[PDB]
Amino acid sequence: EVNXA
Amino acid sequence: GSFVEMVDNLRGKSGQGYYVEMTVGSPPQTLNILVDTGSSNFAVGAAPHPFLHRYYQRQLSSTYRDLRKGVYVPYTQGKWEGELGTDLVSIPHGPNVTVRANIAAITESDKFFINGSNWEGILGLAYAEIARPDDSLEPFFDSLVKQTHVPNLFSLQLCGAASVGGSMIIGGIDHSLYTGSLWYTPIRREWYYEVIIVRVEINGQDLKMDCKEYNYDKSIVDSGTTNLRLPKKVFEAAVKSIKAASSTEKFPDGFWLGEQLVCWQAGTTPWNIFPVISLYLMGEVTNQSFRITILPQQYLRPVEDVATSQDDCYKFAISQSSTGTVMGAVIMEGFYVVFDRARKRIGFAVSACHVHDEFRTAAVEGPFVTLDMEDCGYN
Numbered sequence: 001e002v003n004x005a
Numbered sequence: 006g007s008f009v010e011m012v013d014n015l016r017g018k019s020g021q022g023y024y025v026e027m028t029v030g031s032p033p034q035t036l037n038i039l040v041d042t043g044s045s046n047f048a049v050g051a052a053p054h055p056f057l058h059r060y061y062q063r064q065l066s067s068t069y070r071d072l073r074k075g076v077y078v079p080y081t082q083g084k085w086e087g088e089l090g091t092d093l094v095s096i097p098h099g100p101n102v103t104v105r106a107n108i109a110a111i112t113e114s115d116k117f118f119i120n121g122s123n124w125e126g127i128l129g130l131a132y133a134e135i136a137r138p139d140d141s142l143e144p145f146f147d148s149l150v151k152q153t154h155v156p157n158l159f160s161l162q163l164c165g166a167a168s169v170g171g172s173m174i175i176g177g178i179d180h181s182l183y184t185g186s187l188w189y190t191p192i193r194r195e196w197y198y199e200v201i202i203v204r205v206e207i208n209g210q211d212l213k214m215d216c217k218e219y220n221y222d223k224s225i226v227d228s229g230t231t232n233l234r235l236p237k238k239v240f241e242a243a244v245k246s247i248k249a250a251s252s253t254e255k256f257p258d259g260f261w262l263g264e265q266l267v268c269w270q271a272g273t274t275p276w277n278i279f280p281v282i283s284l285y286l287m288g289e290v291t292n293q294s295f296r297i298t299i300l301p302q303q304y305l306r307p308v309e310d311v312a313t314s315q316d317d318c319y320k321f322a323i324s325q326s327s328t329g330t331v332m333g334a335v336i337m338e339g340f341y342v343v344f345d346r347a348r349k350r351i352g353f354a355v356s357a358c359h360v361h362d363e364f365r366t367a368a369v370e371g372p373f374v375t376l377d378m379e380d381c382g383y384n
Contacts, residue, residue, distance in 0.1 A: 001020030002119070003082035003331075004041030004127070004229005005135045005197075 008179050014098035015040065015163070015171040016123070020231050020306060023163055023334075024124040025173055028095040029108065030066030035059075035097075037124040040161070040173060041229030042198055042344065043331075045136040046078050047094075047145040048087060049126030051110030056118040057125055061110060068093045068105075076109050078137045081230075081328060085114035094145070100155050100175050106148040127229075130159070130344070134196035146346075149175075157347040161228055164358035165302070165338045171358070183341035183354035188295040188371045190286040192349045193382060197225040200351060202330060203294055203378045204285035205239070207246040214242060216381035223329035223383060226342065226351060230333030232263075232322045233282075233304060240325035243282075247323075250280035261321055266308055268318035276301050276362050284336070287378045288371065289350065294378065295371025297353050299339040302360040303367070306335070329383075339367035 017023040022039040029036060029049065036049055036059065050060040063069045072089040088110045095103045111117075111126070118125075133140045133147065150157045155176035162182045163171040172182065193199040202219040205212040221236045235243060244261050254275065259265035269275070279301030288294045306322040322335045339359050343352035359367045 001231050002022045002039075002229060003080065003231070003234075004022055004039060004227055005044035005046070005078060005080060005129065005131070005137065 006177070006180060008174050008177055011099050011174050012172045012179060012182070013170065015173055017169040018122055019167045019169055019308070021119050021122040022124065022229060023169065023171055025099070025128070026097050027128070028097060029061055030092050031068040033095065034061060034065070036061065036126055038126045038128045039124045039229065040130065041127050041227070042130045043225065043227035043229040044078070044080065044127065044129035045131040045133055045144045046076070046109055046127070046129045046142070047106055048078065048085060048109035048111050050118065051087060052112045054114065054118055056120045056122070060125055063090070063110060066092055072107070076138050078109070080117070083115065083117035085111045085117045087111040087113070089142070096175070099173070100153065102153045102155070104149050104152045106145045107142055131197055132195045158343070158345050160341060160343040161337065162341045162356055162358060163228065163334055163337045164356070165360040166307070178343055181357070183357055185355050185369060187343060187352040187354045188369055189289050189345065189350040189352040190295070191289060192351060195349070197223070198344060198351060199223055199225050201287040201378065201381050202284050203287055203375050203381045205243070206283040206285070207243065208250050208280035210246065212239070212242050212246065214239065216378070217383060220330060220381055221383050224332070225329065226332045226337070228334065228337060230331045231306070231335070232324050232331070232333050233335040234324060234326035234331030234333065236330060237325050237327065239330070243323065247280055251278050253278050263321050263324050266311065266318045266320045268311055268316045271315065271317055274317050277364065279305065281365065285373065285375065286353070287381070290372070292374060292376055292378070293372045294375040295369065295373065297336070297340060298368040299336060300361055300365055300367060302362070303339050304335050340369065
């Protein structure tokens with residue numbers, strides 16, 4: 001639910 | 006040794022990342038900042054937004070300086086845009102010292118802020134090589150190190166359990182956050198925190214793949230990622246073996262896809278039928294490696310309920326990716342992770358807070374004689 005560059 | 010002020014400084018929701026409290030501006034403006042070892046930009050909301058309860062007010066800061074330049078940062082999932090600048094920054098439950106750093110003032114965003122996450126900004130702990138717009142924008146931690154005596158290193162301990170918690174040790178290693186010994190794996194290249202996986206096991210059974218597929222096109226540690234992301238080929242092979250191991254019970258294809266979620270009567274979760282997963286990582290000594298092992302309590306993330314009722318439900322937290330392997334929270338929640346930047350290495354140890362049952366425990370063992378490990382890296 002988060003997938004951070 | 007012991008950092009009693011920083012222990013327990015993290016919080017977060019399940020599947021919504023971990024954050025720490027920080028201040029910005031003069032006087033200090035309090036804001037929750039998610040910890041992302043997957044990026045290198047320090048950015049905070051600086052304009053009204055439905056999912057924001059507060060934000061950075063530049064006109065209220067007497068120590069604010071405008072760099073007169075915009076910036077755009079797209080993430081695997083989510084993105085924002087804003088204006089660059091600098092200001093005084095501090096970490097209340099962290100090193101007692103204020104520093105000046107570059108700050109991206111987010112004015113526009115898309116599927117970045119999460120409704121009810123409780124955080125309003127992001128702290129990219131990676132290296133400048135992946136900082137936007139370019140590697141000239143010095144990252145937060147770099148500034149902290151150059152402006153203070155804080156050692157070039159930080160550690161993380163993420164604990165599962167819909168509140169979550171944990172601790173970020175800045176400048177050191179807290180010996181009370183783990184048990185056993187710490188095993189380090191060399192940081193391949195300094196941009197993302199890249200490592201090299203040389204062998205994968207499922208309940209002791211080797212996946213038997215070229216150790217290159219495990220790192221295609223790379224393997225990184227991201228506190229900013231929920232799941233254990235695996236390249237397409239490796240994903241298929243792991244799911245297959247994990248299905249076999251738990252064959253004593255069948256689940257719909259939706260479950261393994263991460264779509265649907267399985268449930269069981271309160272406290273009847275059959276953990277024992279689910280296999281343990283082990284990842285062997287390159288060691289610091291030539292031909293030497295070590296392994297970390299997690300439990301279904303790590304890769305079966307608990308959620309609400311199919312009918313929002315009363316029953317233990319979970320979601321498969323292992324998915325496929327096309328941008329390499331991502332050891333997210335499902336991996337990290339099992340260990341105390343030391344990001345030894347000074348020595349270009351990442352240490353792993355059993356976390357003293359990791360979730361588990363009386364029969365099994367997460368582990369970190371070594372050493373294992375492994376030949377041809379250099380070849381495991383993708384080019």
